[PDB]
Amino acid sequence: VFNRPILFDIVSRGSTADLDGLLPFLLTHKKRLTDEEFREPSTGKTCLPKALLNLSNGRNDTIPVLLDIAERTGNMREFINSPFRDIYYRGQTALHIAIERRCKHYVELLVAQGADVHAQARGRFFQPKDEGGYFYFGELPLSLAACTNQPHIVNYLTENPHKKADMRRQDSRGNTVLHALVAIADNTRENTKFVTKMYDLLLLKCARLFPDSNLEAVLNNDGLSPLMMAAKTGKIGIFQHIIRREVTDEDTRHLSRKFKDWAYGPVYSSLYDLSSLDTCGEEASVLEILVYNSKIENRHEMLAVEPINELLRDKWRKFGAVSFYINVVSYLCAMVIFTLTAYYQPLEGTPPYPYRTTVDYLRLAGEVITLFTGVLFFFTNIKDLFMKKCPGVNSLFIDGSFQLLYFIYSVLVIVSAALYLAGIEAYLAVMVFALVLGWMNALYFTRGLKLTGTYSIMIQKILFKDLFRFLLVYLLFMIGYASALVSLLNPCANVPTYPSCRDSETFSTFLLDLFKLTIGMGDLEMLSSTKYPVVFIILLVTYIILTFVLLLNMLIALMGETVGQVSKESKHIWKLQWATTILDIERSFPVFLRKAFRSGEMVTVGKSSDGTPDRRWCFRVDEVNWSHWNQNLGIINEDPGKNE
Ligand SMILES: CCCCCC/C=C/CCCCCCCC(=O)O[C@H](COC(=O)CCCCCCCCCCC/C=C/CCCCCCCC)COP(=O)(O)OCC[N+](C)(C)C
Ligand SMILES: CCCCCC/C=C/CCCCCCCC(=O)O[C@H](COC(=O)CCCCCCCCCCC/C=C\CCCCCCCC)COP(=O)(O)OCC[N+](C)(C)C
Ligand SMILES: CCCCCC/C=C\CCCCCCCC(=O)O[C@H](COC(=O)CCCCCCCCCCC/C=C/CCCCCCCC)COP(=O)(O)OCC[N+](C)(C)C
Ligand SMILES: CCCCCC/C=C\CCCCCCCC(=O)O[C@H](COC(=O)CCCCCCCCCCC/C=C\CCCCCCCC)COP(=O)(O)OCC[N+](C)(C)C
Ligand SMILES: CCCCCC/C=C\CCCCCCCC(=O)O[C@H](COC(=O)CCCCCCCCCCC/C=C\CCCCCCCC)COP(=O)(O)OCC[N+](C)(C)C
Ligand SMILES: CCCCCC/C=C\CCCCCCCC(=O)O[C@H](COC(=O)CCCCCCCCCCC/C=C\CCCCCCCC)COP(=O)(O)OCC[N+](C)(C)C
Ligand SMILES: CCCCCC/C=C\CCCCCCCC(=O)O[C@H](COC(=O)CCCCCCCCCCC/C=C\CCCCCCCC)COP(=O)(O)OCC[N+](C)(C)C
Ligand code: NA
């Protein structure tokens, strides 16, 4: 009377008037609502999911009934819990369905019987949009309700009579509720609204509940926290909100990262928490994540917030400026040292090994210092291949290209030294390409000034969305005419004189004469040796119009369309270049020296409810406001000033 297909029409239909009869039929035959001849063969779906999917205006009258019949045969902690055993909805239960349908009345019901509030929806659907899934809320019903802008259940699953969902529970990746809100978040307006609210709501609620380590400290199975997870994923709206977290109620002020050290009239000093941002060596940091392994589309907005920008300038003036300007002079000299050898490198015989003088020993000092630079830039770039390297190289204006070019320069100094030692005499030609790269690799060191650093990246953008497009067509106009005009010149079999005639290098030299014409440093050198002389000049004049008057001047005009558009991008890319420069210098120091150039200070920011004073390494920011007069919230230092 009640087989599989007939019921799943009923509970789908929502008619609680023909299923009066399951009990006398589901008791004498000794069946159960959780059998294999009663669930769909593919997923594992049951009456109780099917009801909530087929929900009539927020009300399916069958769920109060089926669980009554479930009890009188007997199952609640096996019926409600029954997960879909698919590889695609794995772990999903009726409760995961009761909240996504946004039905609160039954979440009370499903929890009233004590179903589960930590079942983990591990399916390929319940997977981020980086694996082959759609919607990753975490994996828990609590993490779901928070990640769907549904506060009242997020309260309920915490504050209810029956079994409570704690916030400390990790999903299969370590990610708690707050790790998950950073995952579902985007940097839109309405998303960042409830993300921050439900973010706030919980770590406040974690403190009134378990009075211990904040939930925001709970790392995951990658090693990251919600703040370091926002930095890696590019979530500004929450990333901002964490760093400027002012909590006023003194029971939870310890969940703050912006403080108010003092406020005399309309001037106050704000004091930021650099607990994770600037950790000198020991811990993983927010600042090394934004700058190295993050999303380049939003780093400039994540580095252009509270203390980060002030924090990098506070590193540049200490050590970042100086050490950089020792890196530049040491490189320029190394290229002087590499210049002098090539100018005093002899050019007779086998590769000129014999030195036998003082000057030739001074040259040898230049070749040994040189080969060091090559192998140095070799090893430093190969260890980078095992460590930081491999973004979208050479379309990446944050040392993506220069890493590639110093690697080339590293090869050619090793090749040239191989051939200079293997006896081949073309050490020079390879060495000559190395020399020119290296002086062009001194554009690397234009980061110490917004002027020249903004300059060396426009060069690289006007070399992409600009003069390669030109090289394309210009090679079509040029091969077209170069083949067309040499087709008119008569061979030298006809007889010895090239510049009138055609033989065997005509094309080659003639391209150069056409390359000179477009740019202007050539002469037409009009020729009567051709068989049709008038048609020849019809074609040169079209080359000169369609290449100097039309393209090479349009080439100037496209740059103007570029440098007006990529200027704002270029100021933002420099701030990454500049920052990546600092953290590389800093990272190269030992920990005791980083810990000597700390950007901050210990401050007694409050008591940790045990009398333990909270000694956080922090960063001051003087600020002024002639409108926010009631600055009487968190005045740590009642005596305003720093009183040095
Ligand atoms: C940029 C190019 C990319 C595609 C590859 C195109 C290659 C172009 C080079 C053309 C070489 C010349 C070959 C034809 C002419 C020639 O030489 O003909 C002959 C025979 O040739 C040779 O014996 C070989 C000599 C050259 C070898 C080294 C080239 C190395 C080029 C490397 C590529 C350049 C970029 C490298 C950087 C890569 C990374 C960048 C980032 C990429 C983005 C990530 C004459 O020679 P000769 O020695 O005089 O022989 C004597 C013959 N006799 C007279 C005695 C009978
Ligand atoms: C204190 C605030 C000062 C503010 C005022 C301004 C001061 C500026 C001083 C600048 C110092 C840095 C410049 C020196 C050269 C330098 O650092 O060259 C670096 C590397 O050099 C070293 O490895 C040498 C080891 C020793 C260095 C420090 C010596 C200075 C110490 C004295 C300063 C004062 C503090 C401590 C002294 C100890 C006692 C405790 C203090 C507290 C009181 C007792 C060059 O970079 P490179 O690796 O080539 O680039 C990275 C390459 N990559 C990763 C990008 C590929
Ligand atoms: C990925 C990097 C690795 C590169 C791969 C290529 C490496 C090695 C090739 C060298 C071996 C070939 C020569 C051996 C045979 C020989 O000996 O051949 C010679 C002539 O050979 C040459 O001239 C070889 C020219 C080499 C240059 C290649 C390109 C180098 C790299 C190019 C890329 C970098 C660009 C920079 C430019 C800046 C602009 C853009 C910047 C970027 C944009 C801003 C024959 O004459 P002969 O006197 O008889 O020789 C002596 C022979 N004897 C009599 C002793 C037996
Ligand atoms: C108050 C501060 C007290 C400290 C004072 C200074 C102390 C020590 C100075 C030590 C000098 C050597 C430091 C080397 C640092 C270094 O390794 O630099 C490298 C640069 O390559 C080299 O150096 C090549 C290696 C061979 C050495 C140089 C040539 C031989 C020695 C010359 C020394 C003489 C100097 C100058 C004489 C002329 C003077 C005119 C003044 C004028 C003042 C205006 C940093 O490249 P990287 O960051 O890794 O970026 C590369 C790109 N990539 C890989 C990251 C993408
Ligand atoms: C390759 C490595 C990289 C090197 C980098 C350092 C290079 C240069 C140092 C420049 C420092 C100042 C730059 C700040 C400019 C600025 O801030 O503002 C600029 C104003 O520009 C200037 O005034 C440029 C200088 C004018 C005089 C030229 C020579 C000065 C250098 C020293 C002398 C060199 C000569 C002769 C040598 C003779 C010696 C005997 C040998 C002779 C033979 C024996 C525009 O204002 P704004 O629009 O507001 O800027 C926007 C950026 N903003 C404000 C946000 C930072
Ligand atoms: C996907 C396309 C792939 C196609 C590639 C095919 C290229 C070449 C293979 C064929 C050449 C074989 C060698 C020729 C024979 C030879 O050895 O001839 C030599 C002379 O030297 C040449 O002729 C070689 C220079 C070029 C010649 C024209 C071809 C032009 C090729 C241009 C390729 C264009 C690519 C791309 C377009 C640009 C835009 C970017 C793309 C799209 C986006 C990426 C011997 O002369 P001699 O005996 O003295 O003759 C005298 C005869 N007399 C006096 C008796 C009548
Ligand atoms: C859209 C661009 C392409 C247009 C192409 C179509 C136009 C013309 C091509 C056909 C020309 C044919 C010429 C005649 C054939 C020839 O060559 O006959 C030669 C001699 O010729 C002549 O005496 C012709 C007199 C001069 C007038 C030339 C044409 C008119 C010139 C103005 C052209 C204006 C338009 C265009 C140019 C500006 C372009 C920039 C725009 C933008 C581009 C996108 C044969 O020698 P022979 O009689 O044996 O020697 C003389 C007799 N004696 C004394 C030895 C016995
Ligand atoms: Na213009």
CA distance 238 to 241: 5
Q: Between the CA of residue 28 and those of 4, 24, 73, 128, 512, what are the distances in Å?
A: 18, 6, 10, 47, 99
Atom 36 of ligand 1: nearest residue by CA position: 408
Mutational test site, ligand 5, from 451, 571, 574, max ligand atoms within 8 Å of CB: 451
CB 577 less than 6 A from any atom of ligand 4: no
CA distance 266 to 248: 20
Among the listed residues 315, 380, 321, 326, the one whose alpha carbon sits nearest the alpha carbon of residue 594: 315
* Residue indicated by tokens 């403190």: 207
Continuous segment of H or E residues that includes residue 263: strand 258-263
Tell me, what amino acid is at 568?
K
CA distance 178 to 196: 10
Phi, psi of 616 (to 5 degrees): -105, 140
Mutational test site, ligand 2, from 326, 330, 388, 441, max ligand atoms within 8 Å of CB: 326
Atom 20 of ligand 6: nearest residue by CA position: 504
618 by DSSP, 3-state: which?
A: strand
Q: What b-and-e string marks burial along 170-201, b requiring 16 or more CB atoms within 10 Å of the CB?
A: bbebebbbbbbbbbbbeeeeebbebbbebbeb
Task: Give the number of other CB atoms < 10 A from CB of residue 361.
Answer: 10
CA distance 19 to 29: 16
Among the listed residues 572, 6, 571, 634, the one whose alpha carbon sits nearest the alpha carbon of residue 260: 634
Minimum-distance ligand 3 atom for the alpha carbon of 434: 36
CA torsion sign for 139, 143, 145, 147 is negative
**Which ligand is closest to the CA of 318, given by its number?**
2
Ligand 5 mean position, distance from CA 446 (Å): 11
Ligand 8 mean position, distance from CA 556 (Å): 6
- Is residue 322 a contact partner of residue 316, using CB atoms and an 8 Å limit? no
Ligand 8 mean position, distance from CA 395 (Å): 25
Ligand 1 mean position, distance from CA 428 (Å): 15
Q: In what order do the strands lie in the sheet with 268-273?
A: 258-263, 268-273, 613-623, 601-607
CA distance 94 to 11: 14
**Which ligand is closest to the CA of 542, given by its number?**
7
Atom 39 of ligand 2: nearest residue by CA position: 596
Beta strand 258-263 with 613-623 is unpaired
- Is residue 303 a contact partner of residue 290, using CB atoms and an 8 Å limit? yes
Based on C-alpha coordinates, what's the Rg of the chain? 36
CB 441 less than 6 A from any atom of ligand 4: no
Tokens of 78: 């096996």
Among the listed residues 326, 329, 355, the one whose alpha carbon sits nearest the alpha carbon of residue 341: 355
Ligand 8 mean position, distance from CA 449 (Å): 25
- DSSP character for 490? P
Q: What b-and-e string marks burial along 578-617, b requiring 16 or more CB atoms within 10 Å of the CB?
A: bbbbbbbbbeebeeeebeeebbbeebebbeeeeeeebebb
The full 3-state SS of 391-433, as one line of letters, equals CCCCCCCCCHHHHHHHHHHHHHHHHHHHHHHHCCCCHHHHHHH
Mutational test site, ligand 6, from 475, 488, 504, 509, max ligand atoms within 8 Å of CB: 504
CA distance 631 to 628: 7
Minimum-distance ligand 5 atom for the alpha carbon of 448: 5
Q: Between the CA of residue 593 and those of 312, 318, 599, what are the distances in Å?
A: 17, 12, 12
- Is residue 230 a contact partner of residue 238, using CB atoms and an 8 Å limit? yes
Tell me, what amino acid is at 635?
I
Overall resolution, Å = 3.0
Atom 16 of ligand 2: nearest residue by CA position: 323
CB 345 less than 6 A from any atom of ligand 1: no
Tokens of 577: 């270049």
CA distance 231 to 77: 41
Among the listed residues 274, 311, 327, 295, the one whose alpha carbon sits nearest the alpha carbon of residue 588: 327
CA distance 352 to 118: 77
Task: Give the number of other CB atoms < 10 A from CB of residue 50.
Answer: 21
Mutational test site, ligand 5, from 449, 454, 577, max ligand atoms within 8 Å of CB: 449
